[PDB]
Paper text:
These replicative polymerases have higher processivity when paired with the DNA clamp PCNA. Here we report two cryo-EM structures of human Polε–PCNA–DNA complex, one in an incoming nucleotide bound state and the other in a nucleotide exchange state.
The quaternary human Polε–PCNA–DNA–dTTP structure contains the incoming dTTP that base-pairs with the template in the polymerase site and has the finger domain in the closed conformation. In the nucleotide bound state, the P-domain, the thumb domain, and the C-terminal PIP motif of catalytic POLE1-NTD each interact with a separate PCNA protomer. In the case of the P-domain interacting with PCNA-1 (PCNA protomer-1), the ends of two P-domain α-helices insert into the PCNA-1 PIP-binding pocket, with His-684, Arg-685, Gln-689, Tyr-726, and Lys-729 forming five hydrogen bonds (H-bonds) with PCNA-1 Asp-257, Pro-253, His-44, Lys-254, and Asp-41, respectively. In the case of the thumb domain interacting with PCNA-2 (PCNA protomer-2), two short thumb loops insert into the PCNA-2 PIP-binding pocket, with thumb residues Glu-1085 and Ser-1117 forming two H-bonds with PCNA-2 Tyr-211 and Ile-255, respectively. The PIP motif of Polε adopts a short 310 helix and inserts into the hydrophobic PIP-binding pocket of PCNA-3. The dTTP triphosphate inserts between the palm and finger to H-bond with the main chain nitrogen atom of Ala-629 of the palm and the finger side chains of Arg-765, Lys-769, Lys-809, and Asn-813.
Author numbering:
A (entry chain A): 24 to 182, 212 to 1198
B (entry chain D), C (entry chain B), D (entry chain C): 1 to 261
The structure:
DNA sequence: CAAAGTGAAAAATCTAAAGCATCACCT
DNA sequence: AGGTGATGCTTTAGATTTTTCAC
């Protein structure tokens, strides 16, 4: 009534303020009738008033024209969801819902759609749902909250008559923004014609395809640098912002303070690369209010329609907004920027892109290289090398020269990272993903995959399956309560350990039967690698046998000597997108994951039905040892007991008033305590083998979506491949003017295919996230077990020729003989492809794949609505061969029967680093001693013509660093000592969520809290860097974890903190070396050396490279058993065996 | 069916405690002469024989021959629940997979009955030849357990060398070496205390000390132990369990292989 | 005001060592009729009643009914400092922040007063009924501790059955099926090694074996333990102390869901 | 050329069992007058002093004070092989890199020759002067085995206040304030249970109790422990090894430093 | 309200199962 | 000084947690 009228008045005030904000920043409404051409940049759900005096929402589409003019069009659409209905009675429920929501819905129509979960849904059977269209988004939220308890009640019921017949409302969590992008195909980064013919006629939009080029939008890259209290977390209540540096379309503008900044800042030029240029011109306004005012006027003058920064949702925009609220001028009322409900700040008039929301998701970078200062190295190919981080920064910050250098640095990098990697990739995403660039950059990869599948399902006219919820306290078939339900994923084994160079000869133990069957397989291998790899030389090859006879001669000439010492060929037989290609080979959809009852419900369960693929997977479940009777007993006793009230001094809560999350959190702890007190154990791990079918007749929207995204990724990968071949052509000849062009272009395409790879692998990951429309227990496990089978059969094939070394769920790292055939060139009379290069090991692996892993159940509808379900045999799972590498180094474990998996170092042929995977160098923080050791010790692994000399060089590097770690500070200064032994650790959670839990990071966070305030620990993502002390001897590692922020302050405010946690109030030394645990750091470096060098040397039959590091006791026992001349005999050898008898049951 | 009745129930516990630590899965047998077992370890280094004669038991009931593949890693946990001085009754059926163990208190009141499931086993049976040992030493078992547990802290290679002066148990290791000499008794009349030696030729063999530690968990089984050895012949560790039976431990030696020649 | 004194001061040490492992916190309930303890374990399936009589103390003087918040792990590891024969005296104020307990030697050579910090928690009192029991068994403590520690090796759930033949403790598991049988012991009449039963109905239940292992840390409390068990009533492990009341452990039996229900 | 003989074999065994967990490696400085041993801790807090003269040795023959770098864990492994009453003979030659630890049985039926390996190292000593210690507390070690490891269960940092009435060790910890008090109490003046306090001046001194638990492993070595302390002087806990020797420990005193200083 | 999986190293703490050094009676 | 069972002090074997790489 009166409160609803003032809510509509507030919403109309919101809309008029939004249009005034739009008109200030360009973006005129289309009041004049006519036709205009625009490039869509922005969308937001705002409210509008039509001619019927009704307040409805309208997504305000923003366009940029070719001349630079921009305009805003609010297309009015009515938000909706879909509702289900039990039977054909659809008019009465529609009338009942229309006659009591007469001022809050718009129109009701019955909608035919196809759902994946229906039995017999492939004969041409559809389920008819109901549209309910409202007026506003707030109308949608209020009606959804009003009718949403009926969802839970009608779901729980399983055994006003026109109100209770509804089964389940569908597509209610879908945003109105996302919905309007999906419905009328209005995607960002496309060209459109906008026609307005008055307020009575709705505005019409049409796609325009004859224009393909992109315009140049105004892109702002601002980043601030603020002084603060020394070594504190960023808070805006202490002082103000010194400098903001911001670029306008490759032209940077900087505004500085003058009342605190000493030097009047002059102008300079930044040249990191010829590609990245900023023609700066600086302003020198005197006051901080005038700083923000100059920023407001320059943003209003330039009218930026894309605005990028470093950590805008976390540091920058809260700081400037708190400063603006202090100084009086409102950030919202000036530029549209207010904090929204998720902590992200969204203008109605602009685009916000945090580069971390692209780096942390799509860049495939280590988290230790997630900031801008290290993502510049990994993307732009340049390093900001400015100054020392201590002396010229922490106390010499009065120097405005250095301050402006850093300010320009934090702006050029974000601007050019956007323009080069985030702008084209994110708008190429936005062309297909139905979201604005803020949402595309900010949502998860699973949400991006859900959006892409949502477009494909709406294009196929498929209703969107409901967002599932995480079930609590899942039950095993016997009755145990499941802690976690998992599948067995990829198969990782490290088979060998040691350095395998291609210049040192190594022993091969191939059986002759492998070469005997390869001799007859040669013709098939070259025919398959000439047909399926490149389609053009199908039968046009001239010298088809003139190389094949040489191949057979080379393969059979050294078959006569199977056991042979020879130099190896380090070959990476890698599959290209094995998870998407297994999906694309087997038609693996989460909709297609089908069981026996649902196949029996289908009408196409023929006796010769070639429509079920019965691939298997390995289920895995950890469950409590307590049984179902104990679970019922503890549930009853928890139901009897009264819970404490939620409200302060409120009514007591029973069992049926608490939520399911609270009940599960109570029951988990109260059952785990009973399990530890009554069963000796809490988690029993069980691995189960199970197999389910895949319906090959089903709708292929998931397969089409992953095929379209894999074709996009493979278009970018083919561009990467042809530019890599261009770089290989431009190498080994003199330097030209296009070598750097080829290198940067191949780096850009490698980044592009990695960024598309993240979404493509998140297609596999999407079926295993909470709140997924297309969740599947079986599908991801099936794809992992199929990849495991592929790689273990490749290991079985390789182990009969050479030695497989590192099995991951990628491919085989192996060594093959030098006399094995290799990359040979095949000539062809076709002008398009005169020469085709084909490698032999990938060819025989691809023939193994074609013989066993091919799919003859590939029912694909050639013509829809005709049941012409033809069957093909597409493999597309190819083993791409990486080149013959120089060396491969693998580490070994410190215990018997175990090996370090997912960890190796591979070098390219020119001595360069090809791969360094799994190590602690790339990991965030860790010990910098470990990082320095593992980054410097592998360059010596290429030095030496034999294993003993190679291990001696590696031992020289290791001993040198051990001599440093023992006789520290011979000439080695305290500053690099301090920055050498630091260990950085970061927490995902808050310190108050780490209560009653002991860890080194938790203890040093508590130490930092009781050192300088709790406001360091009230926020998540705390980076604590520390050392492990030793002065309270006998105390554990957690009680001796001590931060490094106490050896920087004054003695009067550091001696108390030195004497508190060292349990020594009488101590006097201020040196860090007395506090440091020498034995702990010796043991850490010794364990690293044992894993890298000494234990693999013992496995490759070298005595000991590093005599300072001892061996484990089992390895010492094996070495002493091998060294001595005495031997173990057997009773079976000494006394004559009577015979092996069998003793059976009685 | 197999029925056994043993008054002094301590010996059976020590027999099993001597067989827990060395054999994970052994094979048992019943004949008319008594209960005998013969099985090896997982590394095929030591053969183990225990023969308990029929008339030594309190009463013996033998019907046929049964081969029993009981796990000895679980037998002295269902048998560890016995006192030493209680009577032990063993029942094994002809065609059932249950082995019944009953313990009776001397007060004839506390009766503990248990059943143990049986399973198949594939163990090589090895024939024992009769060999004339060049050396025989008859030593108290506490001294031999002490000697192997004391030399176990030195190394794993044990050199058993007997010459005309006496018997040497020699071991060497990373912390040094230890060789311990035992001399013949001359004025000792007790059978359980005196040590006697029989010689044909001085022997010099080398064994594994961990297996000698695993052998000597039969220490209060008998107050004496007989060790007989010969060149290129496995050493025997004979524990004479009163008149009840005997327990033999066969140990494969270490001789030097002439790799140069 | 609180003042108490007992010469035989080891009884408090024994009951606190028995209550250390099971219950973490407790509430000391004070009255002229009797001093009550009523605590629940952390898994909330075991209930504890420890009653100490007022007249059993040598000197006792309390003016009103008081409540005390105490964790028994700290109280047990602070009571273990006393010997086996020292005289205990307990002291407190009405609402003090400390509990004063003093140990004095019989020869007055070691007077030791301990002050510990109490913790104020919610004091919950649940009046349980002393329901009449179908079966009681007065049997020694060490024999029951032996029964629990022997059945713990073979299984994890004890099927306790009693009838006219006596009492029976059965188990099952991965090793096998075992049972311990005890008769009426009516032939002899001993003051400590006697197992006397009283039955109105032969009733059998199943219990948790590790909970029985936590219960039988009260072995040095007395040489006679009264197990009380009836159908759908918790088992009462009553330890009767001479003129100091009793300590009862209550364990919920596993009345499992019947397949025919 | 250096030899020594002891009929008492338990003294060296107990002095190695009480010293292995404190010092890993120490140098034995055996002189002509007897066995002297100063030993710094691995964490560089304490000094341990041993003084074993030649009056209790069977035969003593020393020429030069040699320093032998015996590793304590290895020697405690090897001195474990000695018997409780067995005769221990240690022998060192002029050019012997090894140490010949020879054990003789009391029946003279065995010779047990152990060669333990030695490595050479050089350290420096500073000695300790003689002071006047105010408070000397002679007290039975078997009760210190119940006092120290039970006071360390409730608190680490404990203080020692001394007076004419007696000595009080006050345990401050998370559990509370733990006071034990011991007086003279010469009513029954027993020979070994004689709590005698030689009192000169009242001193309050603070100490740690994991560390004071680490000297109290030598309670079977001696019969009574005397400890002497004074104003800001390091504590000397002493033990009396029969009439053979004495075992002293030097604990540097812990001072609670004030914030205002 | 939004949030892609699993495998694995690396270390750090938390438990319990053994190994092994002393006590409750009888000549 | 020798014979049985507890009873407590180290030692080691896994179990569990948490970042942050691999795939
Ligand atoms: C990197 C990554 C891989 N995977 C899975 C999917 C991949 O098929 C498999 C191996 O991926 P990768 O070998 O790293 O990449 P790719 O196989 O998809 O393509 P290419 O080899 O040409 O670079 O691991 C994920 O599920 N998530 C991920 O983040
Ligand atoms: S797999 Fe075959 S039988 Fe099963 S649902 Fe699909 S078409 Fe029907
Ligand atoms: Mg791959």
């Amino acid at each position: 009534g009166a409160t609803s009228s003032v809510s509509a008045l507030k919403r109309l005030e919101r809309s008029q303020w939004t249009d005034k904000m739009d008109l200030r920043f360009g973006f005129e409404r289309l009041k004049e009738p006519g036709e205009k051409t625009g490039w869509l940049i922005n969308m937001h759900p705002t409210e509008i008033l039509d001619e019927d005096k009704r307040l409805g929402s309208a997504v305000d589409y923003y366009f940029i024209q070719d001349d630079g003019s921009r305009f805003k069009v609010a297309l009015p659409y009515k938000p909706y969801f879909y509702i289900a209905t039990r039977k054909g009675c659809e008019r009465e429920v529609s009338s009942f819902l229309s006659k009591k929501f007469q001022g809050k819905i718009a129109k009701v129509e019955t909608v035919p759609k196809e759902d994946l979960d229906l039995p017999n849904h492939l004969v041409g059977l559809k389920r008819n749902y109901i549209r309910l269209s409202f007026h506003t988004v707030e109308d949608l939220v209020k009606v959804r909250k009003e009718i949403s308890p009926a969802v839970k009640k009608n779901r729980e019921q399983d055994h006003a008559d026109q109100l209770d017949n509804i089964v389940d409302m569908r597509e209610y969590d879908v945003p109105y923004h996302i919905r309007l992008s999906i419905d009328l195909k209005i995607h960002v980064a496309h060209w459109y014609n906008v026609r307005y013919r008055g307020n009575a006629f709705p505005v019409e939009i049409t796609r325009r395809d004859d224009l393909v080029e992109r315009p140049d939008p105004v892109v702002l890259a601002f980043a601030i640098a603020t002084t603060k209290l020394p070594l504190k977390f960023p808070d805006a209540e202490t002082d103000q912002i010194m400098m903001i540096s911001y670029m306008i379309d490759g032209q940077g503008y900087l505004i500085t303070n003058r009342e605190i900044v000493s030097e009047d800042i002059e102008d300079f030029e930044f040249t990191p690369k010829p590609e990245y240029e900023g023609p700066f011109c600086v302003f020198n306004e005197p006051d901080e209010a005038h700083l923000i005012q100059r920023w407001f006027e320059h943003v209003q003058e330039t009218k930026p329609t894309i605005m990028v920064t470093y950590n805008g949702d976390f540091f920058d925009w809260p700081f400037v907004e708190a400063r603006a609220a202090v100084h009086g001028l409102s950030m919202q009322q000036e530029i549209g920027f207010q904090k929204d409900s998720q902590g992200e700040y969204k203008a109605p008039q602009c685009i916000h892109m945090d580069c971390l929301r692209w780096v942390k998701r799509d860049s495939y970078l280590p988290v230790g290289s997630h900031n801008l200062k290290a993502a510049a190295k990994a993307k732009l190919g340049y390093d900001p090398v400015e100054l020392d981080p201590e002396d010229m920064c922490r106390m010499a910050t009065e120097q405005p020269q250095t301050l402006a250098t850093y300010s320009v640095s934090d702006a050029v990098a974000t601007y050019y990272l956007y323009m080069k990697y985030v702008h084209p990739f994110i708008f190429a995403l936005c062309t297909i993903i139905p979201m604005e660039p803020d949402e595309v950059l900010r949502k998860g990869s699973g949400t991006l995959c859900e959006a892409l599948l949502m477009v494909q399902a709406f294009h196929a006219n498929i209703i969107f399956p409901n967002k599932q919820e995480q079930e609590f306290n899942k039950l095993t078939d016997d009755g145990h309560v499941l802690d976690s339900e998992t599948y067995v994923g990829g198969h990782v084994e490290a088979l060998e350990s040691g350095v395998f160079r291609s210049d040192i000869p190594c022993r091969f133990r191939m059986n002759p039967a492998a070469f005997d069957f390869l001799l007859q397989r040669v013709e098939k291998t070259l025919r398959h690698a000439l047909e399926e790899e490149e389609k053009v030389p199908v039968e046009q090859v001239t010298n088809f046998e003139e190389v094949c006879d040489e191949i057979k001669s080379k393969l059979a000439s050294l078959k006569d000597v199977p056991s042979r010492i020879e130099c190896p060929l380090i070959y990476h037989l890698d599959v290209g997108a094995m998870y998407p290609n297994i999906i694309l080979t087997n038609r693996l959809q989460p909709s297609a994951m089908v069981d026996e009852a649902t196949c029996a419900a289908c009408d196409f369960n023929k006796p010769g039905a070639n429509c079920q693929r019965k691939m298997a997977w390995q289920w895995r479940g950890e469950f409590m040892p307590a049984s179902r009777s104990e679970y019922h007993r503890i549930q009853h006793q928890l139901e009897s007991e009264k819970f404490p009230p939620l409200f302060p001094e409120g009514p007591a809560r029973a069992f049926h008033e608490l939520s399911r999350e609270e009940q599960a959190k109570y029951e988990k702890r109260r059952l785990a305590d009973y399990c530890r007190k009554a069963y000796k154990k809490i988690h029993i791990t069980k691995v189960e083998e199970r197999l389910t079918t895949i319906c090959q007749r089903e709708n292929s929207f998931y397969v089409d979506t992953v095929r379209a995204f894999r074709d996009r990724r493979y278009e970018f990968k083919g561009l990467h491949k042809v530019w890599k071949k261009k770089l290989s052509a431009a190498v080994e000849v003199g330097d030209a003017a296009e070598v750097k062009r080829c290198k940067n272009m191949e780096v850009l395409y490698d980044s592009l295919q990695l960024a598309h790879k993240c979404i493509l692998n998140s297609f596999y990951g999407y079926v295993m996230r909470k709140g997924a429309r297309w969740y599947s227990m079986e599908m991801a496990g099936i794809v992992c077990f199929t990849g495991a089978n592929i790689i273990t059969q490749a290991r079985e094939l390789i182990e009969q020729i050479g030695r497989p070394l590192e099995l991951d769920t990628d491919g085989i790292w192996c060594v093959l003989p030098n006399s094995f055939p290799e990359n040979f060139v095949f000539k062809t009379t076709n002008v398009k492809k005169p020469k085709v290069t084909i490698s032999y090991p990938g060819a025989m692996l691809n023939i193994m794949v074609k013989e066993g892993f091919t799919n003859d159940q590939y029912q694909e509808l050639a013509e829809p609505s005709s049941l012409t379900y033809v069957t093909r045999s597409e493999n597309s799972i190819f083993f791409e061969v990486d080149g013959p590498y120089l060396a491969m180094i693998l580490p070994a474990s410190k215990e018997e029967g175990k090996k370090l998996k997912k960890r190796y170092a591979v070098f390219n042929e020119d001595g360069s680093l090809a791969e360094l995977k799994g190590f602690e160098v790339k990991r965030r923080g860790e010990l910098q001693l470990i990082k320095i050791f593992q980054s410097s010790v592998f360059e010596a692994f290429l030095k030496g013509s034999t294993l003993e000399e190679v291990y001696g060089s590696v031992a020289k590097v290791a001993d040198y660093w051990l001599d440093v770690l023992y006789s520290k500070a011979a000439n080695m200064p305290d500053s690099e000592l301090f920055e050498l032994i630091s260990e950085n650790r970061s927490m995902s959670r808050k310190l108050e969520d780490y209560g009653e839990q002991k860890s080194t990071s938790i203890s040093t966070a508590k130490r930092l809290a009781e050192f300088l305030g709790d406001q360091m620990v009230k926020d998540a993502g705390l980076s604590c860097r520390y050392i492990i002390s030793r002065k309270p001897e006998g105390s554990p590692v957690t009680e001796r974890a001590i931060p490094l922020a106490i050896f920087q302050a004054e003695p009067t405010v550091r001696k108390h903190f030195l004497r508190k946690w060292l349990k020594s109030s009488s101590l006097q030394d201020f040196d860090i070396r007395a506090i440091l645990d020498w034995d702990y750091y010796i043991e850490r470096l010794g364990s690293a050396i044992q894993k890298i060098i000494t234990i693999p040397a013992a496995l490759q039959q070298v005595k000991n490279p590093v005599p300072r590091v001892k061996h484990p006791d089992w390895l010492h026992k094996k070495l002493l058993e091998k060294n001595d001349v005495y031997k173990q005999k057997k009773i079976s050898e000494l006394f004559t065996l009577e015979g092996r008898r069998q003793v059976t049951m009685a | 069916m197999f029925e056994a009745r043993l008054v002094q129930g301590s010996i059976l516990k020590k027999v099993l405690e001597a067989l827990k630590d060395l054999i994970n899965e052994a094979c048992w047998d019943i004949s008319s002469s008594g209960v005998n077992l013969q099985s090896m370890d997982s590394s095929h280094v030591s053969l183990v024989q225990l023969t308990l004669r029929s008339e030594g038991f309190d009463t013996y009931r033998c019907d046929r021959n049964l081969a029993m593949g009981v796990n000895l890693t679980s037998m002295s946990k269902i048998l560890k629940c016995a006192g030493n001085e209680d009577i032990i009754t063993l029942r094994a059926e002809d065609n059932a997979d249950t082995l019944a163990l009953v313990f009776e208190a001397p007060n004839q009141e506390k009766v503990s009955d248990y059943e143990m499931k049986l399973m198949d086993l594939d163990v090589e049976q090895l024939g024992i030849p009769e060999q004339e040992y060049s050396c025989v030493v008859k030593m108290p078992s506490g001294e031999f357990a002490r000697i192997c547990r004391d030399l176990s802290h030195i190394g794993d290679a044990v050199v058993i060398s007997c010459a005309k002066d006496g018997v040497k148990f020699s071991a060497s290791g990373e912390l040094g070496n230890g060789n311990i000499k035992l001399s013949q008794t001359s004025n000792v009349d007790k059978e359980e205390e005196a040590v006697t030696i029989e010689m044909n030729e001085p022997v010099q063999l080398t064994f594994a000390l961990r297996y000698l530690n695993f052998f000597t968990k039969a220490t209060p089984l008998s107050s004496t132990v007989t060790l007989s050895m010969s060149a290129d012949v496995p050493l025997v560790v004979e524990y004479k369990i009163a008149d009840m039976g005997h327990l033999k431990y066969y140990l494969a030696p270490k001789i030097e292989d002439e790799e140069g020649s």
